[PDB]
Amino acid sequence: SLLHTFWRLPVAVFFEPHEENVLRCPERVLRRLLEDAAV
Amino acid sequence: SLLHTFWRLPVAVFFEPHEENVLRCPERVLRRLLEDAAVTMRGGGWREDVLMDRVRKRYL
Amino acid sequence: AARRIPHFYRVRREVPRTVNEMKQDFVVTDFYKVGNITLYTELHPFFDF
Amino acid sequence: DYEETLRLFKTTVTSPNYPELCYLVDVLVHGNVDAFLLIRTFVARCIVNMFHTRQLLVFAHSYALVTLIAEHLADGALPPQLLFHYRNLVAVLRLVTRISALPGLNNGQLAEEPLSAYVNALHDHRLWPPFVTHLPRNMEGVQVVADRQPLNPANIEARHHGVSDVPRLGAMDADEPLFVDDYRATDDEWTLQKVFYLCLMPAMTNNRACGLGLNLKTLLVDLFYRPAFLLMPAPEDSIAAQRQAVGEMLTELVEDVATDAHTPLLQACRELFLAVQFVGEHVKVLEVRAPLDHAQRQGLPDFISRQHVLYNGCCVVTAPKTLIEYSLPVPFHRFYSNPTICAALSDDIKRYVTEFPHYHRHDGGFPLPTAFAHEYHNWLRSPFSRYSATCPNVLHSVMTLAAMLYKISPVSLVLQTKAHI
Amino acid sequence: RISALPGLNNGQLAEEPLSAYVNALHDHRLWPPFVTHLPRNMEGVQVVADRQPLNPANIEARHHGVSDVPRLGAMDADEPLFVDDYRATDDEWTLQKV
Amino acid sequence: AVQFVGEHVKVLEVRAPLDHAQRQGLPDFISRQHVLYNGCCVVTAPKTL
Amino acid sequence: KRDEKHRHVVNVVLELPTEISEATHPVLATMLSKYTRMSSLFNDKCAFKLDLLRMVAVSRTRR
Amino acid sequence: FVDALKTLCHPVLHEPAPCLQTFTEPMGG
Amino acid sequence: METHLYSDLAFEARFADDEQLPLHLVLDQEVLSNEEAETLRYVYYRNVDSAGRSTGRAPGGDEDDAPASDDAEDAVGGDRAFDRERRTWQRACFRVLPRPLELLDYLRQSGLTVTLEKEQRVRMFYAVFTTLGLRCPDNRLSGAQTLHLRLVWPDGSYRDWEFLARDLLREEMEANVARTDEWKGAGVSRLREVWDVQHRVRLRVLWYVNSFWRSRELSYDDHEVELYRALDAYRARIAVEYVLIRAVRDEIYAVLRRDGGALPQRFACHVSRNMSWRVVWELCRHALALWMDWADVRSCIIKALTPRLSRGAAAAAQRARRQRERSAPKPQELLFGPRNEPAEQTWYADVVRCVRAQVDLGVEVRAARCPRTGLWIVRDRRGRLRRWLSQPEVCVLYVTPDLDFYWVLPGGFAVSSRVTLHGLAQRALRDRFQNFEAVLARGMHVEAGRQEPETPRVSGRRLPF
C-alpha cells in the first residue's frame, strides 16, 4: 500500500506557499473524509 | 530569559520529487475491487440513451 | 434536491462566507478604515460585486 | 391599535408548544374554499378550546389558514375577540401594503406594469413569496423551472378533486408534473401572501421559524387506515375503546386540541378524515428564475435572478415530535433556516451542527445547500437576514422590511423624489 | 443571546467557535456547578474523582431497567461514576451555565 | 418513580487546561473547578430531611 | 375469471380484512372496476390505499 | 480602540514570565 | 421585416441552380442572450438530408467513411476536409433589432398586416431576423430532412441548434405594380413556435402568404423509416464526443491493467511518508466514476482537439516534425548561418472533486517543465501557481496539444496514456466542432495579423443611428 520513494532520507523544507503545499490533512481529517465518502 | 515563545520555522520532513519515485498499488485487493466495477461499467449506461429516449418519448 | 438536502449535509466540511456576508460584520464607523477588506468591491450603489 | 394582537402573535409563533396537527391541516387545506368549508366546525373547536386551554393563538403559521378564517368564519360561533384578532392581523397586512407602496402617485399603467410594481418590489410579481400554495395569475415575465426545463404549457399543471386521479397518487414521489387547483391568485392576495411571508413572519419570530415538507403520501395511509374510517355509520361507552380504535398517533394528536365535552374523539376524527379528498402533493422546490422588468434591465440584461419557493409546504415554528418519521426538513432560504429545529428534525443536520457549532446562527449565516446558496442572485440578500435577527417585535419594525423593499429604478427615483422621500 | 456576539461569531480557531473565545459562558470548559449529564466534547478537559484522571470510557456505564446489585452496593463509592446515557449538547451546556 | 435511581453525591474536581488564546501566559497552567454531581441547589432548611 | 383479480386486488395491494365486504360499501363496487382498468403501479400499494381513503371520504357527507 | 489593535493583541502584553521573575488529594472522600 | 423581403426575392432568384425554400425565422431571449445578440456577427445554416449527411459533399456517398486512426501529421484527413466542411456551410441574411418590441404590434406599426386566428401576446426583449433555406431536392420534400443552424460570435465561438422538418411544418403543411407593395399589403399569414431536436430552444417561424413557394406546388411525405434513419444520423452526431470519452475511460483502465498500477510521478508536488494512500486510491475510483457521470462535450480533450482540426495545426505539425527530425548540428551552420531556437505548453484540464461532487470542466492551464528536475509543474493562465495538487479531496485530468495524456491523483502521480480516436469516423468529428475561421465584415482589417479595433456593436442602449 505504501509508496516507494527514491531519496530514502526525508528533507526539511522552507515551506513556501509560493510552491505547492503537501497533502496537509491529519489523520482526523482522513478518517472523517473516510466517513463522508462512506456516507 | 524564561520560557518564551518565538517564530521558529515549521520543520516537516518531506520528499522532493524525482523521476523514479513510484506510488505502489495493492494489486490483489484493490485491483480486484476495481475488477467488478470495470466489468459492470462496460455493459449499459453509455449516457447515449437518456436524451435519445427522451426525444423518442416526446415523439411516441 | 428536495431529497438531496439531507445528502448535502452528510459531509462535514464548512462553507466559507461570501463577500456580501463579509460586509455586514462591520459597524458604520469601521467601514472606512484599512482594517476592512471589501473596499476593493464596493464600487457602485446600484450593483454588488 | 394593533399592539396587543402583535404581542399575542409574537407569543404564539415562537412558542415551543405549537400544536403539531396544524402543519397537517396546512398541507391538507391548501386554501381551497370548499376544502376549508368542509372542516369549518373542526377548526372552530380547534380555535376556541385551544385558546381557552392555552393562551397561544392557534393557526397563525400559514397565510392561507389566516386569510380564510377572517372571511369564511364570520358566522359567530366564536367569541368576538379571536375573530377580532384575525381581522386585525389582516388589517395589519393591509396597513403594510398601503404604506409600502405610493398610493398618491401611481396612475394607471406603464408598459403593462403598474407603477406601484416599479416603486416597491412587493407589488412586483417577479418576486415570489417563499411559500407558494397557488400559482399567480400574472406569470408572464418569469421562467418557472421545476427540475431541468421551464414549464411553459399548461399540461404539466392539472389536478382534480373527488375524481380519484389514481396515477398522480403514485406520483407524489415524482417531480416533473406540477398540480394547480385552477385558482390562480390575482395580485391583491398575492401581495398579501408576499407581505405575510417576507415582512410579518420573520420580523415577529426574529427568524426562528423553519421550512419542512411532509411525507404525506405514506402518512395518510397509516393515519386513517383504521376500520373507524371505513365502517362509518349513517360504541363510545368508554374512552379506552376510542383510544384503541382511533390509532396510536390520533390518541395524542387530537386528544385535547379538538375534543370538547360535546363531541368525542371519534366524531372529530371522522370530521378531520372528511377533507382528505383534497390530498395535494409532496413538496417540490420550484426554482423560479425571473429576468428583471424594463427599468433595472438597463444595465445587465443577461441577469436572471433565481429564487427558491415551496409547493404544498408548511412554515413550521417548532419540531413535530410525533411526525418525526414522516417529516423531512427543507432549509431553502435565508428566512426560515434555523439549526435547533432542523437538528431536532433531522439527525445528519444535527451531527453537522454539533461538529461546527458556529453555524448555530439566526442571521442567515447558516450554510444553505449549493442549489440554494446563490446569495449574489436572489432578491433578498445578506443585509435582510442580518437585520431580521436583531429587530424588536414592533409593528414599525414589521413595516421596516416593507419600507426596505423599495427598488432602485429610475422610475423609483422619480417616484421617491416627487413624494420627497 | 447577549453573552455571545451573534453578529460576529463565524469562524474557528480549533473546532470550538469564535463564541467560545469571546465569552467564557459559551465554551466547553467552564462547568456549571450542578451538572446532571456529562457534556459532549471534553478534549481539553480531564475530570478527576480519585487521584488519577477518568479519561477512558472504562469507568463509565448506565443501565436502568435491569436493577443490578454492583451499582446499588457502591452508591457512595469513588470509582464508578455511573453517568447518564445522554450527553449534553452545546445549547443545554451553555444554558445550564447561564 | 424509583425506576431511575442515581448514585450518591460526589464532588467532581475538573482539571481543565485553558484555551489556546491565553495558553502562552504560563503554558503549564491548569484550572480547578469543583462542580458537584447528583445534587440540588438547596435554598431552604429542609425541615424533614 | 374476473373474481380472481378482484381477490388479488383486495389481498395483495389493498390488504383489507375480508369482513369489509361488498355488502356494506357500494363505493368498492363502483370504484374497483375502474381500478382494474390498470395493471401497473402495483408496488406502491399506498397510492391505491389512500385512493380508497379519499373515495370513502367523498362518499359520506351531507353534501 | 480599533486603532490600537496593532498594540493590544501583541504577545508581549500576555507574557508574565519576566513579571514573575521580577516580582519575586483524594476527592472521593 | 426588411431582410425577409430581400431574402424572399433572392430565393425567387436563385431557385434555378439551388432548390431551397424561404424559411423565414425570428428568435428571442429564449435562445441567445442580449450580450450574445448585440454583437452577433452572422448566422449559418446547412441542412442534412435523410440518407445523405450533408449537401456540399458528394451526392451518393463520400470519402468520409475512413477513420483518422490516431495519426500525427494529418489530424483528421488532412485539410481538404476543412475546405469541404467550409464549402457546405452557407451564409444567411441577418438583422438584429436590439430593443423591446411586441411582434404583432411591431408588424402592425410597420407596413405589414397580421391576420391571426387570435391575438396572443408575445412579449420578447429583442428580435433577430434571419431566413434559412430548407432544400427541396425534387418537388418532393422529406419529413426527416433536418436543418442545422449556427450562431457565430466575433471571437470565433459558436453555438449549435438543429431541428427536423416535422416540427417546422406540423400545421402549415397540413393546412394546404411591384412585388414589395403587395407583399406589404397582404403580408403574414400566421406565426408558430418551433422546437429543436432536444426540446431546448423555442424559436418562432413566420409564414408569409405572399411567398412564391406556395406557387411551386411542393409535395411532401414523412415516413417512419426515413425518420428512423434521421434518428440514427442524429445518434451518431451526438455520440461522437461521448464515444471519445468512453475511449478515454477504457484507455485509462487498460493502462492501469497493463503495468498493474505501480505508476511513476510526472508532476511536481511533494509527498510525505506518513500519509496513507488507500484513501486516495478509493477517492481516485470514486472520482473517475464521478467524471464518467458528469461527462460533457464542453471538456478538456474536445477543446484540445478544436484547434487541431484546422489547417494551421497541420502546417505547425509538419514544421514541428521537421524540426524535431533534425540531425546533430554542424559547425558550418553555427558559425555563419542563421541559428536555431516551444517555450511553455498550452494544455487543458478537467478538475474533479470527490468530497463536494462538483467537477469543473472548461479549464485552461499553462504547464511547464521544472528546470531542476524532469517533472511537470502547472501554472495558471495569469501566472499564479495552481495549488489543487495539495488538496487530497480532488483529482485532475490533463491533455496536451500533442494529445498526450495525464490523469493526476493527489501527490503529483500521473497515469500516463494517449488518447484513442481509432474507433471514430471522420464526418461526425468534422461537422460537430470544426473550428471556423472568420470572414471579412464590418470592423475588421483586410490583411491578417493586425490589431483589431472595437466591435461594430449594433447597440440596444446607445442610439443606433
I72 exposed, middle or buried (CB, 10 Å; 0-12, 13-18, 19+)? exposed
Find chain I residues with C-beta within 8 A of C15's C-beta.
Answer: none
> What is the C-alpha to C-alpha distance for residues D96 and D90, in angstroms, rounded to an integer?
10
N-terminal to C-terminal alpha carbon distance within chain B: 88
> What is the C-alpha to C-alpha distance for residues I162 and I149, in angstroms, rounded to an integer?
6
Provide the strand spans (E) within E1-98: 34-35, 46-48
Find chain I residues with C-beta within 8 A of B58's C-beta.
Answer: 199
CA I288 to each of CA I253, I304, I397: distance values in angstroms, whole numbers, following the listed order? 10, 20, 10
Contact predicate I317/I402, CB 8 Å? no
Question: How many residues comprise chain I?
Answer: 465
> What is the C-alpha to C-alpha distance for residues D237 and D226, in angstroms, rounded to an integer?
19
Q: Is C3 on the interface with A (CB under 8 A)?
A: no
The values of phi and psi at residue D305, to 5°, are: -75, 120
> What is the C-alpha to C-alpha distance for residues D305 and D369, in angstroms, rounded to an integer?
17
Strand order in the sheet with I202-208: I94-97, I127-135, I20-27, I202-208, I188-195
Q: Which chains touch C (3 or more CB pairs under 8 A)?
A: A, D, E, H, I
Contact predicate I23/I164, CB 8 Å? no
Cross-strand partners of D290: D305
D34, three cell numbers: 370548499
N-terminal to C-terminal alpha carbon distance within chain C: 28
Q: Tell which residue, I39, I54, I133, has the closest CA to residue I438.
A: I39
> What is the C-alpha to C-alpha distance for residues I250 and I419, in angstroms, rounded to an integer?
10
I33, three cell numbers: 442572450
Question: How many residues comprise chain E?
Answer: 98
CA distance H3 to chain F (A): 21
Contact predicate F49/F19, CB 8 Å? no
Reduced to 3 states (helix: H, G, I; strand: E, B; else coil), residue A4 is strand
A6, three cell numbers: 527514491
Q: Tell which residue, I235, I244, I180, I168, has the closest CA to residue I207.
A: I168
Contact predicate D123/D191, CB 8 Å? yes
Find chain I residues with C-beta within 8 A of D152's C-beta.
Answer: 202
N-terminal to C-terminal alpha carbon distance within chain D: 26
Q: Which helix (H) or strand (E) holds I190?
A: strand I188-195
Contact predicate B26/A1, CB 8 Å? yes
Q: Tell which residue, D331, D411, D419, has the closest CA to residue D123.
A: D411
Find chain C residues with C-beta within 8 A of A39's C-beta.
Answer: 10
D162, three cell numbers: 373527488
Find chain H residues with C-beta within 8 A of C33's C-beta.
Answer: 2
Which of F4, F10, F24, F36 is the best residue to mutate to test the E interface, defined by the most E CB atoms within 10 Å of its own CB? F10
The position carrying cell 486516495 is: I280
Find chain D residues with C-beta within 8 A of I358's C-beta.
Answer: 370
Find chain A residues with C-beta within 8 A of C9's C-beta.
Answer: none
Nearest residue in chain E measured CA to CA from C24: E7
CA distance I394 to chain A (A): 11
> What is the C-alpha to C-alpha distance for residues I317 and I298, in angstroms, rounded to an integer?
25
Q: Is A32 on the interface with I (CB under 8 A)?
A: no
- The experimental resolution of this structure, in angstroms, equals 4.0
Q: What is the CA radius of gyration of chain F?
A: 18
Which of H2, H6, H9 is the best residue to mutate to test the C interface, defined by the most C CB atoms within 10 Å of its own CB? H2
D283 residue type, one letter: V
Q: Which helix (H) or strand (E) holds I221?
A: strand I219-221
CA distance C33 to chain H (A): 9
Chains F and D touch (3+ CB pairs under 8 A): no
Find chain I residues with C-beta within 8 A of A24's C-beta.
Answer: 390
D408, three cell numbers: 432602485
> What is the C-alpha to C-alpha distance for residues D171 and G47, in angstroms, rounded to an integer?
9
Residue-by-residue DSSP string for C1-49: -TTTHHHHTTS--PPPP-TTGGGSSS-TTTTTSTT-SGGGT---TT---
Q: What is the β-pairing status of strands E34-35 and F31-37?
A: parallel
Contact predicate G9/G36, CB 8 Å? yes
Q: Tell which residue, I33, I267, I20, I290, has the closest CA to residue I139.
A: I20
CA I144 to each of CA D297, I52, I225: distance values in angstroms, whole numbers, following the listed order? 41, 11, 9
Reduced to 3 states (helix: H, G, I; strand: E, B; else coil), residue I47 is strand
Longest dimension (CA), chain H: 54
Chains D and E touch (3+ CB pairs under 8 A): yes
I207 residue type, one letter: W
Cross-strand partners of I124: I101
Residue-by-residue DSSP string for I366-433: EEEE-SSSS-EEEE-SSS-B-GGGT-TTEEEEEE-TT-EEEEEETTTEEEEEE---TT--SHHHHHHH
Q: Tell which residue, I464, I95, I461, has the closest CA to residue D297.
A: I461
The position carrying cell 417529516 is: D327
> What is the C-alpha to C-alpha distance for residues I341 and I323, in angstroms, rounded to an integer?
10
CA dihedral over H10, H12, H15, H20, signed as positive or negative: negative
Dihedral (Cα; D105, D108, D114, D119), 10-degree rounding? -10
CA distance H19 to chain C (A): 32
Residue-by-residue DSSP string for I166-189: TTTSTTTTTT---HHHHHHHH-EE
I291, three cell numbers: 467524471
A11 exposed, middle or buried (CB, 10 Å; 0-12, 13-18, 19+)? exposed
Nearest residue in chain I measured CA to CA from D143: I30
Q: Which helix (H) or strand (E) holds D36?
A: helix D33-37
Which of I123, I194, I201, I459 is the best residue to mutate to test the D interface, defined by the most D CB atoms within 10 Å of its own CB? I123
I220 residue type, one letter: Y
The position carrying cell 470527490 is: I354
Find chain C residues with C-beta within 8 A of A36's C-beta.
Answer: 10-13
Cross-strand partners of D150: D145
Q: What is the β-pairing status of strands D131-132 and D304-311?
A: parallel
> What is the C-alpha to C-alpha distance for residues I183 and I256, in angstroms, rounded to an integer?
68
The values of phi and psi at residue I383, to 5°, are: 145, -10
B33 residue type, one letter: L
> What is the C-alpha to C-alpha distance for residues D208 and B17, in angstroms, rounded to an integer?
54
Q: Which helix (H) or strand (E) holds I22?
A: strand I20-27
Residue D359 CB coordination number (10 Å): 18
Q: Which helix (H) or strand (E) holds D304?
A: strand D304-311
Q: Which helix (H) or strand (E) holds I240?
A: helix I224-259
Reduced to 3 states (helix: H, G, I; strand: E, B; else coil), residue D131 is strand
Contact predicate I76/I68, CB 8 Å? yes
Contact predicate I353/C9, CB 8 Å? no
Residue F14 φ/ψ region, left for φ over 0, alpha for ψ in the -120 to 50 degree band, beta for the rest: beta
Nearest residue in chain C measured CA to CA from I356: C11
Reduced to 3 states (helix: H, G, I; strand: E, B; else coil), residue A28 is helix
Which DSSP symbol is given to I207? E
CA G47 to each of CA D215, G14, G30, I156, I178: distance values in angstroms, whole numbers, following the listed order? 13, 10, 18, 54, 68
Reduced to 3 states (helix: H, G, I; strand: E, B; else coil), residue A6 is coil
The position carrying cell 396597513 is: D95
Contacting residues for I455 by C-beta, under 8 A, at least 6 apart: I39, I154, I443
Reduced to 3 states (helix: H, G, I; strand: E, B; else coil), residue I261 is coil
CA distance E21 to chain F (A): 8
Which of E3, E5, E9, E43 is the best residue to mutate to test the D interface, defined by the most D CB atoms within 10 Å of its own CB? E9
D88 residue type, one letter: N
CA distance E9 to chain C (A): 9
Reduced to 3 states (helix: H, G, I; strand: E, B; else coil), residue D308 is strand
CA dihedral over F18, F22, F28, F32, signed as positive or negative: negative
Q: Tell which residue, I108, I119, I97, has the closest CA to residue I29.
A: I97
Residue D81 CB coordination number (10 Å): 10
Contact predicate D173/D167, CB 8 Å? no
Dihedral (Cα; I121, I123, I124, I129), 10-degree rounding? 30
CA B13 to each of CA A20, D301, I265: distance values in angstroms, whole numbers, following the listed order? 15, 55, 19
Residue I15 CB coordination number (10 Å): 16
I81, three cell numbers: 476536409
I127, three cell numbers: 428580435
CA dihedral over I324, I328, I329, I332, signed as positive or negative: negative
> What is the C-alpha to C-alpha distance for residues D395 and G8, in angstroms, rounded to an integer?
61
Reduced to 3 states (helix: H, G, I; strand: E, B; else coil), residue H1 is coil
D235 exposed, middle or buried (CB, 10 Å; 0-12, 13-18, 19+)? exposed
Contact predicate I410/I280, CB 8 Å? yes
Q: How many CA within 13 A on the CB side of residue D271?
A: 20
Contact predicate A30/I276, CB 8 Å? yes
Q: How many CA within 13 A on the CB side of residue D152?
A: 14
Find chain E residues with C-beta within 8 A of H28's C-beta.
Answer: 49-50, 77-79
Give the 3-state DSSP-derived string for G13-30, with helices as H, strands as E and coil as C.
Answer: HCCCCCCCCCCCCHHHHH
> What is the C-alpha to C-alpha distance for residues D393 and I97, in angstroms, rounded to an integer?
52
D387, three cell numbers: 437585520
Cβ–Cβ pairs < 8 A, chains D and G: 64
Find chain B residues with C-beta within 8 A of I238's C-beta.
Answer: 48, 51-52
Nearest residue in chain D measured CA to CA from E10: D358
Residue-by-residue DSSP string for I149-165: EEEE-TTS-EEEEEE-S
Alpha-carbon D14 to chain mean position? 15
Residue D226 CB coordination number (10 Å): 16
E88 exposed, middle or buried (CB, 10 Å; 0-12, 13-18, 19+)? buried
Contact predicate I409/I392, CB 8 Å? no
Q: Which runs of consecutive H residues, i.e. helices, occur in chain E?
A: 19-22, 69-72, 90-97
Contact predicate I186/I210, CB 8 Å? yes
Cβ–Cβ pairs < 8 A, chains B and H: 9
Q: Tell which residue, D256, D275, D238, has the closest CA to residue D45.
A: D256
User: What angle in degrees, to the nearest 10, is found between the helix axes of D40-53 and D80-100?
Assistant: 100
Cross-strand partners of I203: I194
Contact predicate D271/D41, CB 8 Å? yes
Q: Which chains touch H (3 or more CB pairs under 8 A)?
A: B, C, E, F
Q: Tell which residue, D332, D32, D317, has the closest CA to residue D185.
A: D32
> What is the C-alpha to C-alpha distance for residues F18 and F30, in angstroms, rounded to an integer?
6
Which DSSP symbol is given to D136? B
Contact predicate D379/D408, CB 8 Å? no
Residue contact B15–A5, C-beta within 8 A: yes
Nearest residue in chain I measured CA to CA from B50: I198
Reduced to 3 states (helix: H, G, I; strand: E, B; else coil), residue E14 is coil
D409, three cell numbers: 429604478
Q: Which helix (H) or strand (E) holds G7?
A: helix G2-8
Reduced to 3 states (helix: H, G, I; strand: E, B; else coil), residue I45 is strand
CA D337 to each of CA D217, D331, D372, G38: distance values in angstroms, whole numbers, following the listed order? 25, 5, 11, 43
CA D328 to each of CA D210, D346, G46: distance values in angstroms, whole numbers, following the listed order? 11, 7, 19
